[PDB]
Amino acid sequence: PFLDIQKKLGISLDRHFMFLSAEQPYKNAARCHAFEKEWIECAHGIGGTRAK
Amino acid sequence: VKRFFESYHEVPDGTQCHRKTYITTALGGICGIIGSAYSVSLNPADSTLEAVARVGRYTFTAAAIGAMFGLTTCVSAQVREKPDDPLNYFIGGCAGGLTLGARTHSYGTAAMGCVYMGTAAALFKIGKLEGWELFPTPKV
Amino acid sequence: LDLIWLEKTIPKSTSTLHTNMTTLTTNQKGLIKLYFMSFLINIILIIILYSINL
Amino acid sequence: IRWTYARSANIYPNFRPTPKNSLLGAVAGFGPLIFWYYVFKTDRDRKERLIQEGKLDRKFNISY
Amino acid sequence: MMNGRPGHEPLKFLPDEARSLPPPKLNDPRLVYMGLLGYCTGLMDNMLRMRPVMRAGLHRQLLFVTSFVFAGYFYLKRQNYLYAVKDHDMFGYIKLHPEDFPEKEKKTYAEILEPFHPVR
Amino acid sequence: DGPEKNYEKTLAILQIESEKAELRLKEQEVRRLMRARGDGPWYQFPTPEKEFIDHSPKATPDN
Amino acid sequence: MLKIILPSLMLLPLTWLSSPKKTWTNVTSYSFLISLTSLTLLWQTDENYKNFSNMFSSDPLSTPLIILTAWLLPLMLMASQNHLKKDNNVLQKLYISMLISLQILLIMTFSATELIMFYILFEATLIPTLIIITRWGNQTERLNAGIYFLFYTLIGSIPLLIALILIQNHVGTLNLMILSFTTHTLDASWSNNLLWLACMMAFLIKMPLYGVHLWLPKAHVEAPIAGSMILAAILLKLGSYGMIRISIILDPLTKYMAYPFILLSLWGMIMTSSICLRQTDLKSLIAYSSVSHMALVIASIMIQTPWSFMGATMLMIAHGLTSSLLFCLANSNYERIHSRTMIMARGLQMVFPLMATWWLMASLANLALPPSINLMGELFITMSLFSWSNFTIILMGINIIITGMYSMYMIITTQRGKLTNHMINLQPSHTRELTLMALHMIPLILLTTSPKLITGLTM
Amino acid sequence: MNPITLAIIYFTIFLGPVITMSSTNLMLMWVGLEFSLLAIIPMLINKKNPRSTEAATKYFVTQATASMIILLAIVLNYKQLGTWMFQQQTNGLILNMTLMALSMKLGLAPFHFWLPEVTQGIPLHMGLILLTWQKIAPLSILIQIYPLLNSTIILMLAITSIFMGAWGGLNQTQMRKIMAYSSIAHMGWMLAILPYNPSLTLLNLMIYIILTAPMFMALMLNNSMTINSISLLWNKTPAMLTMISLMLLSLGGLPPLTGFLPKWIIITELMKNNCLIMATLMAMMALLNLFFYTRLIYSTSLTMFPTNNNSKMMTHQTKTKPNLMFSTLAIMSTMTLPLAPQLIT
Amino acid sequence: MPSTFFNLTMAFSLSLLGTLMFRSHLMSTLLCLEGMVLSLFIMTSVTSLNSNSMSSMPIPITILVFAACEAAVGLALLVKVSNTYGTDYVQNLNLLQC
């Protein structure tokens, strides 16, 4: 986000449902949960260009 | 039309003058169609007949400007044996400005169009000779 | 030269060109029907530009 | 006051472009420039050719 | 471009690494000009409120000068930190990729042949 | 004060300006390289957050 | 340089804090002291340049311009403190503030060591002269004159900014000495030709070059006396100084790219001298004479000869002094008769003998009477131009003939002849304006006595 | 308006862009845009005249259409990638639709036709609130996706924005229309520098805001909506002519004003990225902008237009209208060029 | 699903085309806006149901809430326009050109 008030305060107003592999009601896994988890685990920490 | 305008530059100047004139006429016609669409949308005519008459007049004017530009540029390149000369594009742009003035019935508009469009076409030829980027991707 | 043709060439011709252009661009009718038709033309032109640029 | 105003500020309001004064202005604004251009270009080209082929002698020209 | 750097605290004005930087001298032309701008702001405010320009609102002028100097000092410290961390990242990247920044050997003016253009 | 003062002041000024020019050119090259292949601190474009992914066992075992 | 800049800055609080009965006296005295302080830049006992700081430096070219600016500030105050007697106190102090800001910014511009700071102070000097011309001008056409001046200068200066940023990106620092040492020869492509035109056209506009000189006559006519003085005596020279500073990194393509501008300069000086021959307005005549002299300066800087550079510097200083003097004499006649018509006041030699002597001396300086620095600059420019091409002597000779003709025509039609006896409102003379004429003429005599001060960079 | 509805409407006006800037989710950014639009409509139509009604209607339908296109882009991205953010591999068509809709919300050409008309017919304080506060959230959305945008379409939008803003400001005499075309030109500059360095976009936005705020305050002093109305300001408030002239010159980008700094540094960054043709064309149209500013200065400050007889009674009366924050913003928008390395990052 | 999503996208395109191509009725323009809204809702709902994204299922309801607020404000503005002129004619809403 343009302002990181959520990260500064430590709260998660909307950061916990940003994708399919996020928190789901009654642990009902979405489609391609494993694939999206692998993609995020790969892309984390290296930046957008290196992720692409 | 991307590969069309790229096939404008696949041959050096002074060669395929008919192809260059056809491509420049097509580009001028496209620009005239866009301008006529904007004109009839922002300032609509009294009826559809005069609306399409204005569209046809604008399209023909811009197509004639482009055709005269390409023809005079390729002809000057042929007769001076200098394909990489911005003066050929200046002559073509001045011819296009004279075509604009003839279509608009104004010698002052003809002179202003000649000077401005000749400068623009010379700058375009210089840019294509020396690798200028009109819309560069961000590098730094 | 000075009182006629240099004035006719550089400053008065520049002012005449920009006055004509500002009249042509601010000759709006104030109709939002025409404004939205122009916006539609802009949308179509952006789509065409993206499709030819790829 | 009328004479000064007519000589200074009324000329461009009362100027209309005609082919005759367009031709006169083009000649009087470019012809001397083109003429002196060709004069100076020919003179300096001859001087540079003589200097490059060594046929022009600079006797004591040290401060140019 | 520097917002995505590692160790970037979000919405942090002066992080602790800025404490390694030397502070502004507190009598330096940037802060002196900030105080001058505050005094000019007070004078202009008096003139727009149709008060005497200098002899009216001394507390207001003092508050203007003080607030301008205070904000300018802390903002100047932040900008000094930003420029310092920019140079730190640049030097670190250069040290990390030396093959992309080779030390070119500049020859002396005895092996290179500059073309001579005579003015005559 | 004499000519040596102005001479050595000019030397110091020239050294400062030459170092600044070399630093600016190096900064341009650094920015270009990082933007082309982001691997330094700068131009690190974002990525979805890893900590907001469920790893608890779920209803469907094929996850 | 800071010891000159700081008290000139402190002149503004002096202006706004002085009593209304003491403002002119205090500001004039302390600006004279500022000029006396500025005279210390002539202490050049070495071949080096007085690089005072990382952003301020002195030069054999920059120093006479700085001294001329600091000398012209009190003369501008003396010239302008008569047509502001029926004026509000805060408006008088604002006018003095405009003059002081012009002097400060011009000193900083001439002492700048970095071309981006030079451009910033260039536009900073563009602002208050526009304010002076528009606000304190007399006729209706001052607004059109200010627009012409402002936008000729701006359309010139924008590609200069683009070119300066390009050179800064290519080299790294845009510092004058660094460029002078690590100058690289351009490969003479179309891009380099456009770069040359971009970095030269701003200075050519402000010189002014012929064909683009149309802002100058109306600006000088509609300007007040101090604005005319500062314009004709500093700002054209600022354009020439910019040309000399920027021409060092334009080798070698200035050799062939200088061709249209030399022709424009020579034929334009002939045309403008002819306009002076047929001109019905005295300030217009002085303005077109300024155009011809600056055309000579343009031609010298374009041909890039050491004799040409020295003659350019000497003509810059000499023309600044004599053009300010001519404008002050014309303004004295304008404050007498409330008109600028050339032929209206004729027999002024009878009523104003000492002012006629000042008129005669100013015109003899204008037509380059030897051994004055006017003739020194014009003669060395002629020598360098004849070395460049032997056929330039025809244009030079025609220009000299018409120059003497319009100068002596001005003298005869303004001083000689029968007196216009209907002009009952001819006050004898002001000690202020006679002092102003003396303070213009005496530095011309002193620089004639010692011409080594204004030779410039080359010698 | 009672204070309850004043607090509700102003808090929602504040909360819209705040939610948009603080939101990670594209949907929450969109509902922040919805908050801003819905909350700002009643204050636009607050005066309840036919012109205010027309302005509110035009603004509503324009922003609603642009928000629907934004929502289309968000839903298409959610379909393609399964997430609620344009991460790196979203479709270029989706990104171009996002850019086009955000440019229609911002009001830059050729989507600019409503902005002078909406700015006309509303009170001056609402014009200020519009032209400063309403552009922060769309600019934040554009800034968050800066490496993904298309430089060709962005540069075309920017150059036509600056051209049309210069020509419109040249033609208009109404002060609100002049300020709107000024907004169009400055938004063109911000969009031009957006894909290369959004820090300069933020710098130009802040400079434009601190220049636009006191100009609108000085208009708000006497409700001068016309060139003539601001021209007789010498009789009403003679002490404001110098600051008016300095702020208009700063809007023109003249050195040594601090408004030269955004155009200067944007041109510098474009030269670093080799877009010299675009930079030069933008600079020439900025000169045209400076021309209509200079004509405004000639009307209000350098000359003295004839006054009225009732202006004597207005000088008899006393005013307390210029607030404490006017002079601070005027000075910070006039004399801050020597702090340029601190103003840039 | 892809043919259905293409048809929904074309439905949104038609509703946007109707919004951009005005006729005399501002109410008809608002109806075109509501049709765009409906197409967006159906696209989001079928995407969430296809991807089993129950966490993102509140998003279509939020879309409906904010879009209904938009429609409410549009109806209020149409009330003001009709009180001014007697009709909802966009040709009557034209006097801000000068």
Ligand SMILES: CCCCCCCCCCCCCCCCCC(=O)OC[C@H](COP(=O)([O-])OCC[N+](C)(C)C)OC(=O)CCCCCCCCCCCCCCCCC
């Ligand atoms: C006062 C006169 C005003 C008009 C004349 C101004 C100068 C005319 C000649 C220069 C071109 C225009 C200015 C360009 C500034 C930058 C120059 C530069 O960097 O050049 C190198 C650059 C080239 O960049 P480069 O040097 O990096 O080239 C790369 C080369 N290789 C790859 C081999 C390493 O030239 C340009 O970019 C020029 C593009 C100009 C396009 C826009 C022109 C618009 C119209 C200009 C005039 C407008 C005002 C007058 C209008 C009419 C009034 C009557």
